[PDB]
Amino acid sequence: MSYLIRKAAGIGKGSSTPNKAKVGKLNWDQVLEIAKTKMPDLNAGSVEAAANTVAGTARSMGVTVEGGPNA
Amino acid sequence: MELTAKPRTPKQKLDESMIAAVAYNKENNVSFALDRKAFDRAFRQQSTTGLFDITVEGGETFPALVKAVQMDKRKRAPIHVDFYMVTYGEPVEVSVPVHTTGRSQGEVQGGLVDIVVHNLQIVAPGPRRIPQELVVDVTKMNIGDHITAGDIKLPEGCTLAADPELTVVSVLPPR
Amino acid sequence: KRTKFRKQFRGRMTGDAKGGDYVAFGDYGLIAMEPAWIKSNQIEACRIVMSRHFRRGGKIYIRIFPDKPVTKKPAETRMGKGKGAVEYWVSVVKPGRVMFEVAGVTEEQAKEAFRLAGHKLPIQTKMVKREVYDEA
Amino acid sequence: MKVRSSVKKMCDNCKVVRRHGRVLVICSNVKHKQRQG
RNA sequence: GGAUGUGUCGUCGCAUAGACAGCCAGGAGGUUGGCUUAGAAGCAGCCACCCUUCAAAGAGUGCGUAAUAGCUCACUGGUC
RNA sequence: UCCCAAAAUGUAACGGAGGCGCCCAAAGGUCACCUCAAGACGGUUGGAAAUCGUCUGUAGAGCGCAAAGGUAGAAGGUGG
Question: Which residues 68-127 of C are in CB contact (within 8 Å) with B?
Answer without folding.
Answer: 95-96, 103-104
